[PDB]
């Protein structure tokens, strides 16, 4: 019975957790004019990508570890703060060495923000509201993510990237004091209040099969994402403007996915989870339509036919993600909750990872085309692998 506190804290993690995204994917977004101005190679930026990706999956376990050792509002500001410092600081710079380093400080940065977020989110709400706050929290990246890449190329036309990147770290450390002033951590203002073993747990041949599906899933969209600007722009002919688009219409079905798959989960068909025939069917979608996308656009070919492949690739591929987000909880075995999503957070972390240098090396040695070969290849045998493997025990931890 509180009032006008559940406003303006959830307006405050919204907004910090949109600049949180919305500086890591405005790198991502202008890596190709800095490509154009700073000669680099097909290498370099997998290389930046990898060692971002790896300081950010370290950061979030340990993060998710230690959780209780923090005030949830002093974290969640330094951490906005030195993200904007860390982008300001990117935007005068030149050399590899120095983007690499000032992106591993910003990838570990990163982890601060995500984990706290869950410690208000559990005191400022009843238990009943707490799973669908979570779900619409999670369209922050969605909506931080589906601006940035248009309106980014958009504005390029006059200004150069150094001027997006320091106004993004301005701004960035404006909301950092502006949400420091308003976050509180527990109410407290006027006065507001409301066997299992880790052997049995890793033993159990269902964890890894999650985790494996999610770091093919996490690797496949993290490629698709960061790369197919470049495969549009260069190859096949496109303009930048229309390879930018692409990721716009890759999250505008994504928010979607999001949102849908809690009500076409446990609606309609209801070991196993009835869930299975879902998730096959959305991993076949997403198979499917990165086979046409690499396949069909050709030089010639109307926008709307690709922006229709990057919108049902984003469905298809965000809504896995919220399923096994569902799925890994609530199978999980009694008082190993958290500690049973920390592993399969950090696999995912490492398949995204398993999508910068490698890929970056791939497709320097043959083309673009090959490494996307080689994508939709392993997402189809791991969709078959999944097909084949449903009766398997999903109760670990006691039997
Ligand atoms: O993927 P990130 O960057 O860790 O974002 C955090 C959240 O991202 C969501 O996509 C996951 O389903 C959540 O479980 C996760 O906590």
């Given at each position: 019975?509180?009032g006008?506190?559940?406003?303006?804290?959830?307006?405050?993690?919204?907004?910090?957790?949109?600049?949180?995204?919305?500086?890591?994917?405005?790198?991502?977004?202008?890596?190709?004019?800095?490509?154009?101005?700073?000669?680099?190679?097909?290498?370099?930026?997998?290389?930046?990508?990898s060692?971002?990706?790896?300081?950010?999956?370290?950061?979030?376990?340990?993060?998710?570890?230690?959780?209780?050792?923090?005030?949830?509002?002093?974290?969640?500001?330094?951490?906005?703060?030195?993200?904007?410092?860390?982008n300001?600081?990117?935007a005068?710079?030149?050399?590899?060495?120095?983007?690499?380093?000032?992106?591993?400080?910003?990838?570990?940065?990163?982890?601060?923000?995500?984990?706290?977020?869950?410690?208000?989110?559990?005191?400022?709400?009843?238990?009943?509201?707490?799973?669908?706050?979570?779900?619409?929290?999670?369209?922050?990246?969605?909506?931080?993510?589906?601006?940035?890449?248009?309106?980014?190329?958009?504005?390029?036309?006059?200004?150069?990237?150094?001027?997006?990147?320091?106004?993004?770290?301005?701004?960035?450390?404006?909301?950092?004091?502006?949400?420091?002033?308003?976050?509180?951590?527990?109410?407290?203002?006027?006065?507001?209040?409301?066997?299992?073993?880790?052997?049995?747990?890793?033993?159990?041949?269902?964890?890894?099969?999650?985790?494996?599906?999610?770091?093919?899933?996490?690797?496949?969209?993290?490629?698709?994402?960061?790369?197919?600007?470049?495969?549009?722009?260069?190859?096949?002919?496109?303009?930048?403007?229309?390879?930018?688009?692409?990721?716009?219409?890759?999250?505008?079905?994504?928010?979607?996915?999001?949102?849908?798959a809690?009500?076409?989960?446990?609606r309609?068909?209801?070991?196993?989870?009835?869930?299975?025939?879902?998730?096959?069917?959305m991993?076949?979608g997403?198979?499917?339509?990165?086979?046409?996308?690499?396949?069909?656009?050709?030089s010639?070919?109307?926008?709307?036919?690709?922006?229709?492949?990057?919108?049902?690739?984003?469905?298809?591929?965000?809504?896995?993600?919220?399923?096994?987000?569902?799925?890994?909880?609530?199978?999980?075995?009694?008082?190993?909750?958290?500690?049973?999503?920390?592993?399969?957070?950090?696999?995912?972390?490492?398949?995204?990872?398993l999508?910068?240098?490698?890929?970056?090396?791939?497709?320097?040695?043959?083309?673009?085309?090959?490494?996307?070969?080689?994508?939709?290849?392993?997402?189809?045998?791991?969709?078959?692998?999944?097909?084949?493997?449903?009766?398997?025990?999903?109760?670990?931890?006691?039997?």
């Open positions: 019975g509180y006008y506190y559940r406003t303006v804290i959830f307006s405050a993690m919204f907004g910090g957790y949109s600049l949180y995204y919305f500086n890591r994917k405005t790198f991502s977004f202008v890596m190709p004019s800095l490509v154009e101005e700073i000669p680099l190679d097909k290498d370099d930026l997998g290389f930046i990508t060692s971002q990706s790896a300081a950010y999956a370290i950061s979030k376990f340990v993060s998710g570890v230690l959780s209780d050792q923090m005030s949830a509002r002093w974290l969640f500001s330094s951490g906005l703060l030195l993200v904007g410092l860390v300001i600081f990117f005068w710079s030149s050399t590899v060495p120095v983007f690499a380093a000032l992106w591993f400080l910003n990838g570990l940065a990163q982890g601060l923000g995500w984990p706290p977020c869950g410690k208000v989110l559990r005191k400022w709400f009843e238990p009943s509201q707490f799973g669908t706050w979570w779900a619409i929290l999670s369209t922050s990246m969605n909506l931080a993510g589906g601006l940035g890449p248009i309106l980014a190329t958009i504005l390029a036309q006059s200004y150069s990237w150094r001027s997006t990147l320091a106004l993004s770290g301005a701004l960035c450390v404006v909301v950092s004091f502006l949400c420091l002033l308003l976050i509180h951590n527990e109410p407290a203002d006027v006065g507001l209040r409301n066997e299992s073993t880790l052997q049995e747990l890793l033993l159990s041949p269902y964890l890894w099969v999650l985790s494996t599906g999610y770091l093919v899933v996490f690797g496949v969209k993290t490629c698709c994402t960061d790369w197919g600007q470049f495969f549009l722009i260069q190859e096949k002919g496109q303009s930048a403007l229309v390879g930018s688009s692409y990721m716009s219409a890759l999250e505008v079905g994504g928010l979607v996915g999001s949102i849908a809690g009500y076409l989960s446990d309609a068909m209801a070991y196993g989870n009835p869930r299975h025939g879902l998730l096959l069917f991993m076949a997403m198979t499917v339509s990165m086979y046409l996308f690499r396949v069909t656009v050709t010639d070919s109307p926008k709307l036919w690709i922006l229709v492949l990057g919108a049902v690739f984003g469905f298809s591929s965000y809504g896995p993600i919220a399923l096994f987000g569902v799925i890994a909880n609530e199978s999980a075995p009694p008082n190993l909750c958290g500690t049973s999503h920390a592993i399969v957070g950090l696999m995912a972390n490492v398949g995204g990872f999508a910068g240098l490698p890929f970056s090396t791939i497709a320097k040695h043959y083309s673009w085309s090959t490494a996307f070969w080689v994508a939709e290849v392993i997402c189809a045998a791991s969709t078959a692998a999944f097909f084949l493997l449903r009766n398997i025990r999903t109760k670990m931890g006691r039997v």
